């Protein structure tokens, strides 16, 4: 139904262009320049007609951006350049051979009920030349994709090695985290670690740092910060207009409280919380059982740090488990209070919760796939019946409401998955987001692709009135995919550049919360690159574009548009907003390699599930080779490069430390490290 | 056909008992005591009515045997104790529930042609109670096997840790082998390694040793040794009887040579070969291009050695590849002349050769499975037709000729697989034999189990005249398995204890080759434990016993007999012969864990392939769980214990080195190590 595609594309191009215009209007205004130019303030480079920025973004080269935002963001954006590198030959050759097989003569808005139309290129049985060409194309597609990811993986590896070589000092290039300290009745954990490492690591141990469990104190200090926010807001309200409210601590859910002045209320409760903070501080600093069986341990050289990170320590591999340590900003200090014993319990519980969610969630996807000619209830006929209601507005609905509905029902999902990986326990934001991304990708591949296509094949003609079924169900699913890629591709990228919610929160806090200056830096909140959201969306688009690559080229151009548009929009954003919260130098890239490989193999399997419907069609002896070839090449690249992403060589550590000690022969490493990792709460 | 089993078992018990008798006769004779008591001569514990040894062997405890032969042999024998630990409950419960389902009422010599007999427990369709009991039994079988291998794997791990802790000094507890030295135009390989390690490993590098390529010199020195053997034999012939032969260097393939005296011949050719050895020695010691890009590198502590072994060195993981080093006796000095570039070429070529062999080899297995009522050609009727020829001798043939034929056609196969893994290139006898064992197990599982069962299902009634097929073909295959387990179980173990070929070679060399004393140690050749042969046979028996465990318990007792018999025979042998050629402290045990797991999962899959023939029989929701549970538990144990077998912890190295330096504060490590690893040819 090409007209549905047309009207949806038109309305979305319009909405995107409107969004770009409003962005120009709000950006050119300097009185809110802070939010649209968060960076250059955090970097300290500034203080205090519309498409003009599109050429502006594509000016700053790669190395300067790397120095600017960090290699993380650069590679995360390079993902899009990758995908375009895969797909542009995909688009050209798919549209160049698949369609001229003989829009000229393809599906052209057809349905399976055409049991009498009997159009030319319609079904399986023999189609020798057609099927062989399809196979040859699938083969060459996979060949090209393999070449591309091999080259890209090599480049990312070289980039990461060069970066960490030239990277300056960080207090986590020595420190290593050791898990599972076996308890002893007499010796405290700290001195256990001291003895172990003094005797086990000679000439290289420098100092350790016991991990505490102040999660209760962290909770109460967050409570204090919240209460101070409330005090400041209410005080600004009183200053602006002299009046005291009787809200019982909530206003909305506030009971029949008096709060005649409410200033004495807040000052007294703030004092109470502060003094209880004092008692909590003293008791946590005076409690051995608060000590946890882990402690950050700092070395004297990168060499020793790497060596102790990459090798086991004690006979029992569940005992004294050692691993690289993140930045003091990076480590999630609320998950070092979970003993390693209950980790697997938590992990399996979260697997259970994830399965229940990915199963409860087919109900919304089916409710979305109800996008068919079925309309509202009969009792509201005057409500849902108008002059025509079935001419063009129906194309608008079929091309618009599905996309917006699905994108609305994938709204809280990253929040839920972040909660899942958080209470799972990982202690490092980098790994938290990588895990949540993996989970969200699994969620997408299960629910919002396979569940949708199966449900669609189910609704019309009722599973064909009780392989050959999907062999006529795939195309209209390509249609729904075009609709959704529109809505949560181009319009979504527009919303990304607009930055609405941070803007409005910024203005609200300036109006009500901010009382003076120097809180602007506190007030301004550049967010983050949001890897957990950006990564799975693009991986889904890889999945969908490859699986439809030889079946229907009509999908590809929309993919290519989205890739270029997001590339440019995110380059601008990274340059000007979205500071890197942590710094994991190209950590996740093997995840990309794997997930793209997985989408590739799924593509080949589904192409099998279509083509092989004719038994003994002489197709299986080729189509089964491709999944194996993909997996074999994936192991080739895994073992050929992934080292640089998974584990740090030693000659590099030696070279880096030689150069550092040449430049700075008078660095007090011990003083620099001892106060690191103490705790955010502990000053 | 129970009578075939009976006659085969009877003749094999007789032949085994005869073999034990001849063994007693030859052992009690002291004039050949050397060969049947090879050890206690190599260990230097001795110089210069029949079942009496069976209690004698089961006296010496485990630790003393470990100190005697080595932990390798102890665990290799403990394999059998393992298997009995699995199977005894398997036998008891299989025979206790499977048969009393209701020999009393089971297959009892039936064929699929009984389309009118229509016996009770015969086919699939519903058999609710029977099939559910079969399922429950498969479940409990797998549970028990999992418990057993978990406990056994734990014990082997504890044993290996304790052993290497108490193990005394060996010149390969420091040395590490480094592969792929990147060539440089000016610097030689040795000094490249010197610079790299002095700068990269400080305070711990001790010395290296360049790997040479004297494989040509090794070949010519083996030629010299062979020629000296020929000289000694011919000289003893002349001394015994004064006569000179005219054999032209081969005798059999000897041409019309003169050899009027042939003593001047051999002395002159020996001199020529010796002087050419001299020139070869000088040119190899004076040739840079003979140097290979690898060199044995020795450290000062176990700590440093382990650290440099378990961590990558240079950016390129194909460059300077480092790995643990074996003993000077252990390393296969003929495969250090193969550059790492051509290794993968060789590996793939050997995969090709292995596939062609495992495919050409179905022809002999089918020729064996021709064991049916088909007899010799018609033209030889007086030759193959006798008074009866079809009463009892046919049972003898059907229970005897298959076993002997198959065991004869698996004769050269370990030799071929050793050649395969040798010219593949591995440099370490330990890994050579482990790889050859893996290959031989693959060969068995492909050809001599699956090919045999499929061919058998194919011959009778011609694939049932063009699942349900094997569902009546499995039993007679259990019959053929009983026959073969007989022949190459019990009789094979008898032959193992008899030690015929080393005996006869020993007597021949004493008679003809030996000229004096002090060559007895040279003359005596205890062979080796022959892991490459013993391991796959027992793994095959695991495969077969587990796959038939709930289908036909009648197989199990023969397995149990073989296990106990080989346990005792090999305990005796290990005690008294079969010195350990190398010493890999429980290296291969994870291979055992994996291969038994593989047999277990294959068992569960075949039980599926039988039981599920009734579609929707409510069996699949359980039978698919078992393979996954097995694989999951296998990863549980892998990650929970395999460390101790795959990679050496560090606290252990530190403790060992502390204790050594406490005991021997005056050990010249450098002098002790520098001359190690030089080459066997180089003194």
Rg (CA), chain A: 29
3-state secondary structure A358-379: HHHCHHHHHHHHCCCCCCCCHH
Residue B656 to chain A, least CA–CA distance (Å) = 11
Q: How far is CA A487 from the centre of its chain?
A: 19
Give dist(CA B298, CA B209) in Å, integer.
Answer: 8
Note whether B650 contacts A203, CB cutoff 8 Å.
Answer: no
3-state secondary structure A444-462: HHHHHHHHHHHHHHHHCHH
Tell me the three state secondary structure of residue B207. strand
Q: How far is CA A317 from the centre of its chain?
A: 32
| B647 chain-A contacts, CB cut-off 8 A | 311-312
Give dist(CA A485, CA A494) in Å, integer.
Answer: 13
- Quick one: CA dihedral A625, A627, A629, A632, positive or negative? negative
Note whether A643 contacts B317, CB cutoff 8 Å.
Answer: yes
Q: Are A74 and A62 in contact (CB under 8 A)?
A: yes
Helices (H), B58-181: 62-68, 71-93, 128-166
Tokens at B50, concatenated:
């029949």
Tokens at B583, concatenated:
């010493």
Where chain A is broken, by preceding residue (C–N > 2.5 Å)?
Answer: 48, 102, 466
Q: Are B21 and B50 in contact (CB under 8 A)?
A: yes
Residue that the structure tokens 């229907």 belong to: A552
Q: Are A179 and A313 in contact (CB under 8 A)?
A: no
Which residues is A179 bridged to in the sheet?
A321
Note whether B644 contacts A199, CB cutoff 8 Å.
Answer: no
Q: Count of alpha carbons within 13 Å of A79, Cβ hemisphere only?
A: 27
| B649 chain-A contacts, CB cut-off 8 A | 311-315
Give dist(CA B247, CA B269) in Å, integer.
Answer: 15
Tokens at B647, concatenated:
């990679």
Note whether A651 contacts B313, CB cutoff 8 Å.
Answer: yes
Q: Residue B149: CB partners within 8 Å, gap ≥ 6?
A: B82, B86, B593, B596, B597, B637
Resolution in A: 3.6
Residue B313 touches partner A, C-beta closer than 8 Å? yes
Q: Are A443 and A356 in contact (CB under 8 A)?
A: no
List phi, psi (to 5°) of B123: -140, -170
Q: In 10 A of CB B173, how many CB atoms?
A: 22
Burial of A392 (0-12, 13-18, 19+ CB in 10 A): exposed
Q: How far is CA B439 from the centre of its chain?
A: 10
C-alpha distances in Å from residue A437, one per residue of A200, A415, B323, B601: 38, 12, 36, 33
Residue A647 touches partner B, C-beta closer than 8 Å? yes
B 29-68 → A contacts, CB under 8 A: none
DSSP state of A315: S
B 515-544 → A contacts, CB under 8 A: none
DSSP state of B428: B
Q: Residue A148: CB partners within 8 Å, gap ≥ 6?
A: A82, A85, A86
Q: How far is CA A452 from the centre of its chain?
A: 22
Q: Residue B152: CB partners within 8 Å, gap ≥ 6?
A: B78, B82, B85
Give dist(CA A23, CA A498) in Å, integer.
Answer: 5
Residue A306 touches partner B, C-beta closer than 8 Å? yes
Give dist(CA B373, CA B112) in Å, integer.
Answer: 16
Residue B372 gets the label, from left (phi > 0), alpha (psi -120 to 50) or beta, of beta
Q: Are A216 and A280 in contact (CB under 8 A)?
A: yes
* DSSP line for A500-545: HHHHHHHHHIIIII--SSS-HHHH-------HHHHHHHHHHHHHHH
Tokens at A429, concatenated:
């934001």
Give dist(CA A653, CA B659) in Å, integer.
Answer: 31
Which residues is B252 bridged to in the sheet?
none
Q: Which helix (H) or strand (E) holds B639?
A: helix B625-641
Nearest to A670, CA basis, from A169, A322, A167, A205 = A205
Residue B182 touches partner A, C-beta closer than 8 Å? no
Give dist(CA B22, CA B16) in Å, integer.
Answer: 10
Q: In 10 A of CB A36, how many CB atoms?
A: 21
| A628 chain-B contacts, CB cut-off 8 A | none
Q: Give the orientation angle of helix B625-641 with respect to helix B128-166, to 10 degrees.
A: 10
Tokens at B70, concatenated:
């080595």
List phi, psi (to 5°) of B208: -110, -175
Nearest to B540, CA basis, from B403, B416, B437, B399 = B437
Note whether B307 contacts A307, CB cutoff 8 Å.
Answer: yes
Nearest to B648, CA basis, from B211, B259, B173 = B173
Tokens at B73, concatenated:
């042999």
Nearest to B66, CA basis, from B603, B666, B644, B574 = B574
Which residues is A176 bridged to in the sheet?
A297, A324
Residue A462 to chain B, least CA–CA distance (Å) = 24
Give dist(CA A526, CA A577) in Å, integer.
Answer: 6
Q: Which helix (H) or strand (E) holds B566?
A: helix B556-576
Q: Which helix (H) or strand (E) holds B395?
A: helix B393-408
Tokens at B581, concatenated:
């050629």
Residue that the structure tokens 């090879």 belong to: B38
3-state secondary structure A394-451: HHHHHHHHHHHHHHHCCCCHHHHHHHHHHHHCCCEHHHHHHHHHHHHHHHHHHHHHHH
- Quick one: CA dihedral A139, A142, A147, A148, positive or negative? positive
Residue B521 to chain A, least CA–CA distance (Å) = 41
List phi, psi (to 5°) of A324: -50, 155
CA angle (B212 as vertex; B208, B218 as ends), nearest 5? 135
Give dist(CA A345, CA B640) in Å, integer.
Answer: 16
User: Going along B47-100, which residue ranges are E strands?
Assistant: none
Q: Which of A639, A644, A649 sits opposite B313 (nearest CB)?
A: A649
Q: In 10 A of CB A134, how many CB atoms?
A: 21
Q: How far is CA B154 from the centre of its chain?
A: 23
Q: Residue B400: CB partners within 8 Å, gap ≥ 6?
A: B7, B8, B11, B483, B487
Q: In 10 A of CB B639, how many CB atoms?
A: 11
Note whether A314 contacts B639, CB cutoff 8 Å.
Answer: no
User: Going along A389-455, which residue ranges are E strands?
Assistant: none
Where chain B is broken, by preceding residue (C–N > 2.5 Å)?
Answer: 48, 102, 466
Count the helices and strands in chain B (H runs, E runs).
30, 4
Q: Which of B203, B315, B651 sits opposite A649 (nearest CB)?
A: B315
Give dist(CA B395, CA A92) in Å, integer.
Answer: 72
Note whether A315 contacts B200, CB cutoff 8 Å.
Answer: no
Give dist(CA A59, CA A61) in Å, integer.
Answer: 6
Tokens at B110, concatenated:
């039936």
Tell me the three state secondary structure of residue B142. helix
Tokens at A233, concatenated:
């807001």
Give dist(CA B396, CA B401) in Å, integer.
Answer: 8
CA angle (B160 as vertex; A639, B69 as ends), nearest 5? 120
Give dist(CA B1, CA B107) in Å, integer.
Answer: 10
Q: Which helix (H) or strand (E) holds A298?
A: strand A295-299
| B200 chain-A contacts, CB cut-off 8 A | 650-651, 654
Q: Are B78 and B136 in contact (CB under 8 A)?
A: no
- Counting other chains too, the contacts that B468-473 makes at CB distance below 8 Å and 24 or more residues apart are B468/B124, B468/B613, B470/B609, B470/B610, B471/B123, B471/B124, B471/B610, B471/B613, B472/B112, B473/B112
Give dist(CA B25, CA B17) in Å, integer.
Answer: 13
Burial of B289 (0-12, 13-18, 19+ CB in 10 A): exposed
Alpha carbon dihedral B66, B586, B562, B470, in 10-degree steps, equals 170
Residue B640 touches partner A, C-beta closer than 8 Å? yes
Nearest to A407, CA basis, from A15, A3, A6, A2 = A15
Alpha carbon dihedral B547, B553, B554, B557, in 10-degree steps, equals 90
User: Where exactly are the structural domains of chain B?
Assistant: 2-169+342-648, 215-285
Residue that the structure tokens 């999908």 belong to: A555
Tokens at A359, concatenated:
């199963």
Rg (CA), chain B: 29
Q: Are B416 and B357 in contact (CB under 8 A)?
A: yes
Q: How far is CA B597 from the centre of its chain?
A: 18
Buried b (16+ CB within 10 A) or exposed e, A284-316: beeeeebbbbbbbbbbbbbbbbbbbbbbbbbbb
Tokens at A184, concatenated:
């002893």
Q: Are B344 and A681 in contact (CB under 8 A)?
A: no
Q: Are A661 and A286 in contact (CB under 8 A)?
A: no
List phi, psi (to 5°) of B255: -85, -165
Alpha carbon dihedral A358, A362, A367, A368, in 10-degree steps, equals 70
Q: Residue B520: CB partners within 8 Å, gap ≥ 6?
A: B34, B514
Q: Are A157 and A652 in contact (CB under 8 A)?
A: no
* DSSP line for B330-383: TB-TTSTTS-GGGHHHHHHHHHHHHHHHHHHTHHHHHHHHT-SS--S-GGGHHH
| A318 chain-B contacts, CB cut-off 8 A | 640
Q: Residue A191: CB partners within 8 Å, gap ≥ 6?
A: none
Q: How far is CA A247 from the centre of its chain?
A: 40
CA angle (B59 as vertex; B58, B64 as ends), nearest 5? 110
Q: Give the orientation angle of helix A413-424 with respect to helix A531-547, to 10 degrees.
A: 120
Alpha carbon dihedral A593, A596, A599, A600, in 10-degree steps, equals -90
Give dist(CA A348, CA A363) in Å, integer.
Answer: 24
Nearest to B111, CA basis, from B353, B525, B460, B421 = B460
DSSP state of A30: G
A 470-499 → B contacts, CB under 8 A: none
Q: Are A515 and A236 in contact (CB under 8 A)?
A: yes
Give dist(CA A509, CA A233) in Å, integer.
Answer: 9
Q: Which of B310, B317, B658 sits opposite A310 (nearest CB)?
A: B310
Which residues is B428 bridged to in the sheet?
B331
Q: In 10 A of CB B566, how many CB atoms?
A: 25
């Amino acid at each position: 139904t090409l007209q549905d595609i047309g009207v949806s594309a038109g309305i979305n191009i319009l909405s995107a262009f409107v969004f770009f215009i409003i962005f120009a209007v709000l950006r050119l205004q300097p009185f809110n320049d802070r939010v649209y130019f968060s960076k250059w303030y955090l970097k300290g480079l500034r203080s205090s007609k519309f498409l003009n920025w599109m050429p502006e973004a594509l000016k700053m080269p790669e190395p300067e951006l790397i120095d600017h935002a960090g290699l993380d963001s650069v590679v995360y954006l390079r993902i899009y350049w990758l995908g375009l590198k895969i797909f542009t030959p995909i688009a050209v050759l798919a549209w160049a051979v698949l369609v001229p097989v003989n829009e000229m003569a393809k599906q052209l808005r057809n349905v399976t009920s055409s049991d009498i139309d009997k159009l030319s290129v319609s079904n399986i049985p023999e189609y020798s030349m057609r099927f062989w060409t399809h196979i040859v194309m699938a083969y060459a597609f996979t060949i090209w994709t393999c070449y591309v990811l091999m080259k890209e993986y090599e480049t990312i590896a070289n980039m990461r090695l060069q970066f960490v070589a030239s990277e300056a000092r960080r207090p986590d290039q020595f420190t290593v985290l050791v898990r599972n300290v076996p308890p002893d009745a007499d010796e405290s954990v700290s001195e256990l670690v001291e003895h172990f490492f003094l005797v086990n690591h000679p000439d290289h141990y420098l100092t350790h740092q016991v991990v505490c469990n102040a999660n209760k104190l962290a909770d109460l200090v967050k409570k204090k910060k919240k209460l101070q926010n409330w005090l400041d807001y209410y005080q600004l309200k009183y200053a602006r207009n002299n009046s005291q409210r009787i809200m019982v601590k909530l206003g909305f859910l506030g009971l029949w409280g008096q709060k005649v002045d409410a200033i004495e209320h807040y000052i007294a409760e703030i004092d109470k919380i502060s003094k209880e903070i004092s008692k909590e501080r003293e008791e946590v600093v005076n409690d051995p059982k608060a000590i946890m069986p882990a402690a950050f341990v700092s070395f004297k050289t990168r060499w020793a740090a790497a060596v102790c990170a990459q090798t086991q320590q004690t006979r029992n591999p569940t005992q004294w488990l050692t691993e690289w340590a993140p930045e003091p900003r990076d480590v999630f200090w609320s998950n070092l209070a979970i003993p390693y014993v209950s980790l697997t319990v938590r992990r399996l519980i979260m697997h259970v919760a994830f399965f229940f969610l990915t199963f409860f969630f087919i109900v919304p996807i089916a409710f979305v796939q109800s996008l068919a000619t079925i309309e509202g209830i009969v009792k509201a006929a005057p409500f849902l019946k108008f002059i025509v209601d079935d001419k063009f507005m129906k194309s608008v609905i079929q091309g618009f409401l599905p996309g917006i509905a699905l994108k609305l029902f994938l709204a809280f999902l990253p929040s839920i998955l972040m909660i899942m990986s958080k209470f799972e326990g990982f202690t490092s934001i980098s790994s938290l987001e990588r895990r949540a991304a993996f989970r969200y990708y699994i969620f997408n591949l299960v629910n919002v692709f396979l569940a949708s296509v199966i449900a669609g094949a189910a609704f019309e003609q009722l599973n064909s009135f009780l392989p050959k079924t999907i062999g006529v169900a795939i195309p209209m699913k390509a249609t729904f995919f075009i609709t959704y890629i529109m809505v949560d591709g181009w319009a979504g990228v527009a919303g990304e550049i607009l930055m609405l919610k941070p803007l409005i929160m910024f203005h609200l806090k300036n109006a009500f919360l901010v009382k003076t200056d120097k809180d602007r830096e506190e007030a301004m909140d550049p967010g983050s690159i949001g890897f957990n959201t950006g990564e799975p969306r693009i991986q889904l688009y890889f999945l969908l574009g490859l699986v439809y690559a030889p079946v229907t080229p009509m999908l590809l151009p929309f993919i290519l548009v989205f890739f270029a548009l997001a590339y440019i929009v995110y380059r601008h954003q990274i340059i000007n907003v979205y500071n890197q919260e942590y710094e994991s130098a190209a950590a996740f890239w093997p995840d990309v390699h794997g997930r793209v490989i997985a989408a590739l193999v799924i593509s080949q399997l589904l192409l099998m599930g279509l083509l092989g419907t004719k038994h003994a069609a002489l197709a299986a002896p080729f189509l089964i080779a491709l999944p194996v070839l993909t997996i074999g090449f994936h192991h080739f690249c895994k073992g050929r490069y992934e080292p640089a992403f998974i584990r740090y060589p030693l000659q590099e550590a030696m070279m880096k430390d030689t150069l550092e000690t040449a430049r700075e022969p008078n660095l007090n490493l011990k003083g620099y490290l001892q106060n690191a990792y103490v705790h955010p709460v502990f000053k």
